[PDB]
Structure formats: C-alpha cells, structure tokens
mmCIF file of C-alpha atoms and ligand atoms in Angstrom:
data_model
loop_
_atom_site.group_PDB
_atom_site.id
_atom_site.type_symbol
_atom_site.label_atom_id
_atom_site.label_comp_id
_atom_site.label_asym_id
_atom_site.label_seq_id
_atom_site.Cartn_x
_atom_site.Cartn_y
_atom_site.Cartn_z
ATOM 1 C CA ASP E 1 0.000 0.000 0.000
ATOM 2 C CA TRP E 2 1.338 3.499 -1.034
ATOM 3 C CA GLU E 3 -1.979 5.523 -0.979
ATOM 4 C CA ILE E 4 -1.358 8.803 0.984
ATOM 5 C CA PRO E 5 -4.559 9.757 2.933
ATOM 6 C CA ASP E 6 -6.105 13.257 2.295
ATOM 7 C CA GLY E 7 -5.021 16.358 4.332
ATOM 8 C CA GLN E 8 -1.382 15.129 4.838
ATOM 9 C CA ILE E 9 0.047 16.587 1.532
ATOM 10 C CA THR E 10 0.547 20.408 1.915
ATOM 11 C CA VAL E 11 0.693 21.786 -1.719
ATOM 12 C CA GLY E 12 2.975 24.866 -2.192
ATOM 13 C CA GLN E 13 4.395 26.794 -5.223
ATOM 14 C CA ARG E 14 3.442 25.615 -8.787
ATOM 15 C CA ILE E 15 6.632 24.968 -10.934
ATOM 16 C CA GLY E 16 5.059 23.642 -14.225
ATOM 17 C CA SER E 17 2.270 21.663 -16.023
ATOM 18 C CA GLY E 18 4.223 19.123 -18.206
ATOM 19 C CA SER E 19 2.507 16.584 -20.563
ATOM 20 C CA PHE E 20 -0.100 15.522 -17.873
ATOM 21 C CA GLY E 21 -1.568 17.493 -14.903
ATOM 22 C CA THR E 22 0.210 20.259 -12.868
ATOM 23 C CA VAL E 23 3.494 19.868 -10.817
ATOM 24 C CA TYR E 24 3.896 21.726 -7.448
ATOM 25 C CA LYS E 25 6.572 21.744 -4.708
ATOM 26 C CA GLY E 26 4.968 20.149 -1.580
ATOM 27 C CA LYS E 27 5.520 19.161 2.087
ATOM 28 C CA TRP E 28 5.084 15.477 3.167
ATOM 29 C CA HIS E 29 7.610 14.388 5.895
ATOM 30 C CA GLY E 30 9.905 17.063 4.318
ATOM 31 C CA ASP E 31 9.987 18.669 0.802
ATOM 32 C CA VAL E 32 8.348 16.685 -2.116
ATOM 33 C CA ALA E 33 7.036 17.146 -5.720
ATOM 34 C CA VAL E 34 3.257 16.660 -6.430
ATOM 35 C CA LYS E 35 1.937 15.950 -10.005
ATOM 36 C CA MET E 36 -1.834 16.737 -9.660
ATOM 37 C CA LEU E 37 -4.847 16.594 -12.082
ATOM 38 C CA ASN E 38 -7.747 18.979 -11.074
ATOM 39 C CA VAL E 39 -11.316 17.842 -12.156
ATOM 40 C CA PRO E 40 -11.794 12.527 -14.067
ATOM 41 C CA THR E 41 -12.052 10.886 -17.573
ATOM 42 C CA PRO E 42 -11.258 7.147 -18.141
ATOM 43 C CA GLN E 43 -8.105 8.128 -20.190
ATOM 44 C CA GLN E 44 -6.860 10.456 -17.330
ATOM 45 C CA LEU E 45 -7.443 7.594 -14.785
ATOM 46 C CA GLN E 46 -5.605 5.117 -17.141
ATOM 47 C CA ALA E 47 -2.582 7.529 -17.487
ATOM 48 C CA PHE E 48 -2.406 7.884 -13.634
ATOM 49 C CA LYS E 49 -2.788 4.062 -13.056
ATOM 50 C CA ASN E 50 0.003 3.382 -15.661
ATOM 51 C CA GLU E 51 2.345 6.170 -14.343
ATOM 52 C CA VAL E 52 2.063 4.858 -10.703
ATOM 53 C CA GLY E 53 2.221 1.236 -12.061
ATOM 54 C CA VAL E 54 5.699 1.954 -13.624
ATOM 55 C CA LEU E 55 7.095 4.137 -10.755
ATOM 56 C CA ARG E 56 6.125 1.533 -8.035
ATOM 57 C CA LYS E 57 8.462 -1.025 -9.831
ATOM 58 C CA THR E 58 11.564 1.306 -9.472
ATOM 59 C CA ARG E 59 13.908 1.200 -6.403
ATOM 60 C CA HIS E 60 17.204 2.664 -7.782
ATOM 61 C CA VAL E 61 19.286 5.754 -6.769
ATOM 62 C CA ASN E 62 19.561 7.039 -10.428
ATOM 63 C CA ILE E 63 15.719 6.775 -10.968
ATOM 64 C CA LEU E 64 13.478 9.529 -9.456
ATOM 65 C CA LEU E 65 12.149 8.162 -6.096
ATOM 66 C CA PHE E 66 8.338 7.625 -6.112
ATOM 67 C CA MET E 67 7.020 8.032 -2.487
ATOM 68 C CA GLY E 68 3.196 7.544 -2.853
ATOM 69 C CA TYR E 69 -0.056 8.578 -4.663
ATOM 70 C CA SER E 70 -3.469 10.155 -3.752
ATOM 71 C CA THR E 71 -6.809 8.681 -5.089
ATOM 72 C CA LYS E 72 -9.089 11.055 -3.062
ATOM 73 C CA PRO E 73 -9.766 13.904 -2.938
ATOM 74 C CA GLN E 74 -8.047 14.315 -6.420
ATOM 75 C CA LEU E 75 -5.496 12.242 -8.462
ATOM 76 C CA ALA E 76 -1.841 13.040 -7.407
ATOM 77 C CA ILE E 77 1.653 11.357 -7.536
ATOM 78 C CA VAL E 78 4.260 12.309 -4.818
ATOM 79 C CA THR E 79 8.031 11.948 -5.597
ATOM 80 C CA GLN E 80 11.201 13.248 -3.831
ATOM 81 C CA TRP E 81 12.105 16.970 -4.226
ATOM 82 C CA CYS E 82 15.560 17.655 -5.843
ATOM 83 C CA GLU E 83 17.591 20.927 -5.632
ATOM 84 C CA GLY E 84 19.316 21.469 -9.045
ATOM 85 C CA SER E 85 18.487 21.648 -12.809
ATOM 86 C CA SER E 86 17.935 19.251 -15.792
ATOM 87 C CA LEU E 87 21.064 18.251 -17.825
ATOM 88 C CA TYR E 88 19.462 20.276 -20.730
ATOM 89 C CA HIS E 89 19.466 23.442 -18.512
ATOM 90 C CA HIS E 90 23.173 22.969 -17.470
ATOM 91 C CA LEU E 91 24.472 22.193 -21.029
ATOM 92 C CA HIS E 92 22.301 24.438 -23.309
ATOM 93 C CA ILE E 93 20.685 27.338 -21.259
ATOM 94 C CA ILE E 94 23.309 28.402 -18.583
ATOM 95 C CA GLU E 95 26.069 26.498 -20.566
ATOM 96 C CA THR E 96 28.002 24.914 -17.613
ATOM 97 C CA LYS E 97 31.550 23.704 -18.623
ATOM 98 C CA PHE E 98 31.831 20.396 -16.608
ATOM 99 C CA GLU E 99 35.268 18.631 -16.328
ATOM 100 C CA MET E 100 35.634 15.504 -18.592
ATOM 101 C CA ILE E 101 35.666 13.119 -15.529
ATOM 102 C CA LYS E 102 32.214 14.528 -14.423
ATOM 103 C CA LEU E 103 30.773 14.304 -18.025
ATOM 104 C CA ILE E 104 31.799 10.560 -18.031
ATOM 105 C CA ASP E 105 30.367 10.228 -14.446
ATOM 106 C CA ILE E 106 26.967 11.681 -15.658
ATOM 107 C CA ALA E 107 27.077 9.260 -18.677
ATOM 108 C CA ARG E 108 27.885 6.310 -16.294
ATOM 109 C CA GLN E 109 24.977 7.200 -13.906
ATOM 110 C CA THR E 110 22.458 7.656 -16.822
ATOM 111 C CA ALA E 111 23.605 4.197 -18.142
ATOM 112 C CA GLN E 112 23.130 2.669 -14.599
ATOM 113 C CA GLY E 113 19.543 4.073 -14.508
ATOM 114 C CA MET E 114 18.603 2.950 -18.066
ATOM 115 C CA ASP E 115 20.188 -0.538 -17.469
ATOM 116 C CA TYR E 116 17.939 -0.929 -14.342
ATOM 117 C CA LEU E 117 14.719 0.123 -16.233
ATOM 118 C CA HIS E 118 15.542 -2.343 -19.118
ATOM 119 C CA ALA E 119 16.246 -5.129 -16.513
ATOM 120 C CA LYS E 120 12.668 -4.399 -15.162
ATOM 121 C CA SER E 121 11.354 -4.484 -18.832
ATOM 122 C CA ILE E 122 10.546 -0.692 -18.717
ATOM 123 C CA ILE E 123 11.088 1.246 -22.018
ATOM 124 C CA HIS E 124 11.372 5.026 -21.161
ATOM 125 C CA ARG E 125 10.212 6.103 -24.714
ATOM 126 C CA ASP E 126 11.294 9.784 -24.102
ATOM 127 C CA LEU E 127 14.878 9.840 -22.701
ATOM 128 C CA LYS E 128 16.621 13.247 -23.329
ATOM 129 C CA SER E 129 18.763 15.811 -21.367
ATOM 130 C CA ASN E 130 15.409 17.475 -20.295
ATOM 131 C CA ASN E 131 14.450 14.191 -18.445
ATOM 132 C CA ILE E 132 17.916 13.775 -16.739
ATOM 133 C CA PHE E 133 17.948 15.821 -13.459
ATOM 134 C CA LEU E 134 21.244 16.642 -11.594
ATOM 135 C CA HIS E 135 20.416 16.488 -7.814
ATOM 136 C CA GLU E 136 22.745 19.081 -6.133
ATOM 137 C CA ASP E 137 24.369 19.250 -9.669
ATOM 138 C CA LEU E 138 25.966 15.813 -8.777
ATOM 139 C CA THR E 139 23.594 12.754 -8.911
ATOM 140 C CA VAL E 140 21.584 11.807 -12.083
ATOM 141 C CA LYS E 141 17.808 11.198 -11.517
ATOM 142 C CA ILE E 142 15.935 9.830 -14.630
ATOM 143 C CA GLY E 143 12.209 10.781 -14.763
ATOM 144 C CA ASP E 144 9.425 12.198 -17.018
ATOM 145 C CA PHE E 145 9.234 15.959 -16.147
ATOM 146 C CA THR E 146 9.818 22.133 -23.008
ATOM 147 C CA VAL E 147 10.721 25.878 -22.326
ATOM 148 C CA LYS E 148 10.790 27.128 -26.010
ATOM 149 C CA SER E 149 13.516 24.426 -26.600
ATOM 150 C CA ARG E 150 15.093 25.347 -30.028
ATOM 151 C CA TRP E 151 11.784 24.871 -32.025
ATOM 152 C CA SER E 152 9.591 27.390 -30.058
ATOM 153 C CA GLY E 153 6.583 27.519 -32.509
ATOM 154 C CA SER E 154 3.692 25.057 -31.743
ATOM 155 C CA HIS E 155 3.494 21.735 -33.733
ATOM 156 C CA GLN E 156 -0.346 21.496 -33.383
ATOM 157 C CA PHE E 157 -0.973 20.495 -37.078
ATOM 158 C CA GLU E 158 2.389 18.583 -37.537
ATOM 159 C CA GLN E 159 2.507 14.739 -37.079
ATOM 160 C CA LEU E 160 5.533 14.628 -34.647
ATOM 161 C CA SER E 161 4.675 17.116 -31.799
ATOM 162 C CA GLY E 162 7.374 16.117 -29.223
ATOM 163 C CA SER E 163 11.233 16.250 -29.182
ATOM 164 C CA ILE E 164 12.741 14.799 -32.419
ATOM 165 C CA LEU E 165 16.556 15.161 -31.828
ATOM 166 C CA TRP E 166 16.526 12.084 -29.477
ATOM 167 C CA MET E 167 14.110 9.948 -31.655
ATOM 168 C CA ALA E 168 15.765 6.960 -33.486
ATOM 169 C CA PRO E 169 15.231 6.658 -37.299
ATOM 170 C CA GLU E 170 12.668 3.758 -37.007
ATOM 171 C CA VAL E 171 10.728 5.826 -34.345
ATOM 172 C CA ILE E 172 10.543 8.805 -36.833
ATOM 173 C CA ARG E 173 9.447 6.796 -39.954
ATOM 174 C CA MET E 174 6.899 4.781 -37.752
ATOM 175 C CA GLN E 175 6.693 1.848 -40.284
ATOM 176 C CA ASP E 176 5.830 -0.502 -37.313
ATOM 177 C CA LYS E 177 2.689 0.254 -35.156
ATOM 178 C CA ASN E 178 5.057 0.309 -32.077
ATOM 179 C CA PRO E 179 8.703 1.114 -33.117
ATOM 180 C CA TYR E 180 9.811 1.786 -29.455
ATOM 181 C CA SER E 181 12.331 -0.802 -28.099
ATOM 182 C CA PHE E 182 15.377 -1.050 -25.741
ATOM 183 C CA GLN E 183 17.520 -0.103 -28.818
ATOM 184 C CA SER E 184 15.271 3.013 -29.399
ATOM 185 C CA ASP E 185 16.220 4.091 -25.786
ATOM 186 C CA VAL E 186 19.947 3.295 -26.555
ATOM 187 C CA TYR E 187 19.865 5.686 -29.607
ATOM 188 C CA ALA E 188 18.304 8.413 -27.350
ATOM 189 C CA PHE E 189 21.149 7.772 -24.792
ATOM 190 C CA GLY E 190 23.580 8.021 -27.777
ATOM 191 C CA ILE E 191 22.330 11.623 -28.380
ATOM 192 C CA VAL E 192 22.680 12.403 -24.592
ATOM 193 C CA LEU E 193 26.368 11.202 -24.885
ATOM 194 C CA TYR E 194 26.722 13.605 -27.890
ATOM 195 C CA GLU E 195 25.266 16.524 -25.784
ATOM 196 C CA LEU E 196 27.733 15.779 -22.891
ATOM 197 C CA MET E 197 30.891 15.493 -25.108
ATOM 198 C CA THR E 198 30.051 18.439 -27.509
ATOM 199 C CA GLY E 199 28.096 20.666 -25.026
ATOM 200 C CA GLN E 200 25.683 21.165 -28.015
ATOM 201 C CA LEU E 201 22.441 19.706 -29.521
ATOM 202 C CA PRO E 202 22.959 17.677 -32.754
ATOM 203 C CA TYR E 203 22.293 19.069 -36.313
ATOM 204 C CA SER E 204 23.274 22.698 -35.337
ATOM 205 C CA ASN E 205 24.108 23.621 -39.022
ATOM 206 C CA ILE E 206 20.420 22.849 -40.033
ATOM 207 C CA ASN E 207 17.493 25.203 -39.030
ATOM 208 C CA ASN E 208 14.476 23.285 -40.600
ATOM 209 C CA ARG E 209 12.800 20.801 -38.152
ATOM 210 C CA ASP E 210 10.944 18.928 -40.987
ATOM 211 C CA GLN E 211 14.250 18.406 -42.924
ATOM 212 C CA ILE E 212 15.957 16.906 -39.787
ATOM 213 C CA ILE E 213 12.870 14.598 -39.310
ATOM 214 C CA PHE E 214 13.085 13.463 -43.012
ATOM 215 C CA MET E 215 16.920 13.106 -43.233
ATOM 216 C CA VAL E 216 17.364 11.285 -39.826
ATOM 217 C CA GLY E 217 14.425 9.038 -40.955
ATOM 218 C CA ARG E 218 16.020 8.119 -44.352
ATOM 219 C CA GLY E 219 19.505 7.847 -42.692
ATOM 220 C CA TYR E 220 21.172 10.855 -44.482
ATOM 221 C CA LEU E 221 21.927 12.512 -41.049
ATOM 222 C CA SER E 222 23.864 11.296 -37.974
ATOM 223 C CA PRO E 223 25.672 13.598 -35.454
ATOM 224 C CA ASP E 224 29.193 15.007 -36.261
ATOM 225 C CA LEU E 225 31.459 13.205 -33.704
ATOM 226 C CA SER E 226 34.467 15.498 -34.625
ATOM 227 C CA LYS E 227 32.710 18.260 -32.512
ATOM 228 C CA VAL E 228 33.581 16.304 -29.245
ATOM 229 C CA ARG E 229 36.242 17.748 -26.840
ATOM 230 C CA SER E 230 39.944 16.866 -27.576
ATOM 231 C CA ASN E 231 40.393 15.064 -24.155
ATOM 232 C CA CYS E 232 37.229 12.913 -24.825
ATOM 233 C CA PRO E 233 38.497 9.255 -24.906
ATOM 234 C CA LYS E 234 38.517 7.421 -28.326
ATOM 235 C CA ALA E 235 36.690 4.543 -26.474
ATOM 236 C CA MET E 236 33.759 6.990 -25.765
ATOM 237 C CA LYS E 237 33.704 8.234 -29.441
ATOM 238 C CA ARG E 238 33.555 4.515 -30.537
ATOM 239 C CA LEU E 239 30.733 3.740 -27.972
ATOM 240 C CA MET E 240 28.809 6.899 -29.126
ATOM 241 C CA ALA E 241 28.883 5.647 -32.792
ATOM 242 C CA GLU E 242 27.669 2.107 -31.738
ATOM 243 C CA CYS E 243 24.744 3.714 -29.753
ATOM 244 C CA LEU E 244 23.757 5.926 -32.786
ATOM 245 C CA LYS E 245 23.880 3.120 -35.473
ATOM 246 C CA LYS E 246 20.936 3.716 -37.906
ATOM 247 C CA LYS E 247 20.056 -0.051 -38.089
ATOM 248 C CA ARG E 248 18.209 -1.178 -34.874
ATOM 249 C CA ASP E 249 19.847 -4.623 -34.167
ATOM 250 C CA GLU E 250 23.458 -3.246 -34.671
ATOM 251 C CA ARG E 251 22.976 -1.084 -31.453
ATOM 252 C CA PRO E 252 24.215 -2.650 -28.146
ATOM 253 C CA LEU E 253 22.205 -3.112 -24.869
ATOM 254 C CA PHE E 254 22.990 -1.272 -21.575
ATOM 255 C CA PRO E 255 24.758 -4.251 -19.844
ATOM 256 C CA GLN E 256 27.544 -3.955 -22.542
ATOM 257 C CA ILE E 257 27.283 -0.078 -22.717
ATOM 258 C CA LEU E 258 27.600 0.340 -18.884
ATOM 259 C CA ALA E 259 30.544 -2.190 -18.903
ATOM 260 C CA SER E 260 32.364 -0.171 -21.674
ATOM 261 C CA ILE E 261 31.944 3.153 -19.700
ATOM 262 C CA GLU E 262 33.119 1.669 -16.303
ATOM 263 C CA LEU E 263 36.251 0.328 -18.180
ATOM 264 C CA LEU E 264 37.299 3.702 -19.779
ATOM 265 C CA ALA E 265 36.404 5.455 -16.425
ATOM 266 C CA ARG E 266 39.269 3.630 -14.561
ATOM 267 C CA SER E 267 41.936 4.587 -17.208
ATOM 268 C CA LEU E 268 41.809 8.435 -17.583
ATOM 269 C CA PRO E 269 44.421 10.836 -16.044
HETATM 270 C C1 WJ9 D 1 5.944 14.980 -9.370
HETATM 271 C C2 WJ9 D 1 6.191 13.964 -10.470
HETATM 272 C C3 WJ9 D 1 5.440 12.798 -10.459
HETATM 273 C C4 WJ9 D 1 5.618 11.828 -11.432
HETATM 274 C C5 WJ9 D 1 6.545 12.006 -12.449
HETATM 275 N N1 WJ9 D 1 6.639 10.939 -13.360
HETATM 276 C C6 WJ9 D 1 7.816 10.328 -13.697
HETATM 277 O O1 WJ9 D 1 8.885 10.721 -13.260
HETATM 278 N N2 WJ9 D 1 7.844 9.266 -14.540
HETATM 279 C C7 WJ9 D 1 6.676 8.619 -15.149
HETATM 280 C C8 WJ9 D 1 7.146 7.388 -15.943
HETATM 281 C C9 WJ9 D 1 8.549 7.102 -15.344
HETATM 282 C C10 WJ9 D 1 9.391 6.456 -16.441
HETATM 283 C C11 WJ9 D 1 10.730 5.938 -15.922
HETATM 284 F F1 WJ9 D 1 11.490 5.586 -17.046
HETATM 285 F F2 WJ9 D 1 11.379 6.925 -15.169
HETATM 286 F F3 WJ9 D 1 10.548 4.804 -15.124
HETATM 287 C C12 WJ9 D 1 9.054 8.518 -14.939
HETATM 288 C C13 WJ9 D 1 7.310 13.171 -12.476
HETATM 289 C C14 WJ9 D 1 7.136 14.150 -11.488
HETATM 290 C C15 WJ9 D 1 7.954 15.375 -11.547
HETATM 291 C C16 WJ9 D 1 7.702 16.353 -12.523
HETATM 292 C C17 WJ9 D 1 8.511 17.497 -12.534
HETATM 293 N N3 WJ9 D 1 8.341 18.502 -13.495
HETATM 294 C C18 WJ9 D 1 9.024 19.807 -13.350
HETATM 295 C C19 WJ9 D 1 8.375 20.821 -14.310
HETATM 296 C C20 WJ9 D 1 10.566 19.702 -13.543
HETATM 297 O O2 WJ9 D 1 11.276 20.192 -12.391
HETATM 298 N N4 WJ9 D 1 9.478 17.626 -11.623
HETATM 299 C C21 WJ9 D 1 9.749 16.746 -10.671
HETATM 300 N N5 WJ9 D 1 10.814 17.074 -9.827
HETATM 301 C C22 WJ9 D 1 10.823 18.435 -9.263
HETATM 302 C C23 WJ9 D 1 12.273 18.780 -8.904
HETATM 303 O O3 WJ9 D 1 12.744 17.835 -7.934
HETATM 304 C C24 WJ9 D 1 12.687 16.462 -8.362
HETATM 305 C C25 WJ9 D 1 11.288 16.069 -8.865
HETATM 306 C C26 WJ9 D 1 8.985 15.571 -10.610
HETATM 307 CL CL1 CL D 2 7.758 -0.359 -3.195
HETATM 308 CL CL1 CL D 3 13.602 30.061 -30.214
HETATM 309 CL CL1 CL D 4 25.623 17.456 -35.702
#
C-alpha cells in the first residue's frame, strides 16, 4: 500500500504543467514534488494508473524516487524533491563547462539508470537531457518531467509534436505500429552522450525541423562526432557511434554499454 490519505500533503508553489496534470513543490515528511490533475475521464485515470504502475516497480538511486499517490480527494503522484536543474538546462541554457571526468560520471549514472529500467522491462520512450535531473548538480535522476527548446513555434498540425533530436530513425518513420524498443532508448542515450561530449544539440548547421525529421528518418543525417572535446576518450567516441547506429539490431544493450563506460572510467588521467 502506497496511498497517501487526504489532508497530509501540503501543496505549495506551482513549478510547471508538463505533458499531464500540474506539478507543485509540496511538504510530506519534508519537501516533495506533487503531479496533480484537477477535475476525471477514463483516459486520465488510465494515465495515472500506468504512471504509478511503472514508478512503483523502481527502487534505484539514479531513478526519481516515487514516495506515494493520492486517489481522493483528487489524483496526485508524490516523488522526492531535488535541488538542481535538468542536464538540458546545465548544457544548453546556462552552458556549464563540466570537467571531462564529471561528463563521463553523468554518462555512467544515466547508463546505470537505463540498465535498471531495461532489466525491469521498462522502455522510457522519451529519454533526453530534459528528463535527466542533476540532484545538487551531482547525482543523475531519470524521470518524465519544453521551455521554447530550439523549435519554439507550436506543432499542433504537424505529425511529430514532441522532441525529435533524441528519436531513433525507425521511431521517426513509424513503419511498425510500435517502433519503441530497448535499442530506441539506446539511440536516445547516444544523443545524450553527444550533448555531454560536444556541449551542443545535434544538427546545429540545419534550421528546418521537418528536414531533420526526413533526413534522420532516411539515414542521411547522424551527429558530427568530430565536434567532441579533444580530451574525450577514443573509447567513448567509438561507444557513441555504436549507440547511434541507424540499423536497430546493430545497437548494443545497456549491460555492454555500462561495462564499456566503467572500463574507460578507470583509465583516464
Ligand atoms: C511529481 C512527479 C510525479 C511523477 C513524475 N513521473 C515520472 O517521473 N515518470 C513517469 C514514468 C517514469 C518512467 C521511468 F522511465 F522513469 F521509469 C518517470 C514526475 C514528477 C515530476 C515532474 C517534474 N516537473 C518539473 C516541471 C521539472 O522540475 N518535476 C519533478 N521534480 C521536481 C524537482 O525535484 C525532483 C522532482 C517531478
Ligand atoms: Cl515499493
Ligand atoms: Cl527560439
Ligand atoms: Cl551534428
């Protein structure tokens, strides 16, 4: 049982809305985060039931800690509160210059988290620097949390509405009814590795969203790995390429990926 009875959760400042509901800072045996829907439709109830149903299966330090939910008086999910920013914020907005050892550490922790989810047969489906939080700018927390991010104009009448830089080629073309897989999450992680080592989003030379969608889809685009830092290990550049392979089955799984990163971690001056 994880149901939090009514009147315990003290809701505070609103911080955002996200894809579903509204997210506030809270108090419940200390600071918390509260994702709340205010009304409930059968599709809203199914989203809630599924979101709790995934989170309740995760006990890992690099996954965002679920703490409990509220059925009455309204639908709500309570997670830990974290002081810090998303990886996206650090790298692209305020443009933090992390040391190479810390960039590899962030990569290692993200791999640890993704490996755990895949071991539990959980496909994230929307991994990206936005959904990697740095708790005290130190510890990676993977979740599902955007702010005029590159393509500011609304994609209301477009097919692909969400974030396309992290989507694998098979996920863009959508030839299968469900093209999401463990290898689709590996490609997304591949782009996160690119962000860490370049300090930049991929396809910077191109300014047409639709052209990136098309070209990544038909395999004419993959990120320019020469843009990495000079003290980036060759072993990382090789791993990055394996993660971003256009063909699905040629991409490795996180057990091998995490192994490769922990190896090159030990040997760097
Ligand atoms: C309150 C809440 C409840 C639920 C979820 N849902 C999930 O994380 N997931 C659903 C599927 C599962 C997939 C898996 F792959 F992770 F397993 C991940 C997120 C949040 C939330 C949403 C947000 N948004 C704001 C705008 C970002 O600052 N911020 C937080 N944090 C605030 C800062 O301090 C740490 C917390 C928390
Ligand atoms: Cl539990
Ligand atoms: Cl803009
Ligand atoms: Cl690029």
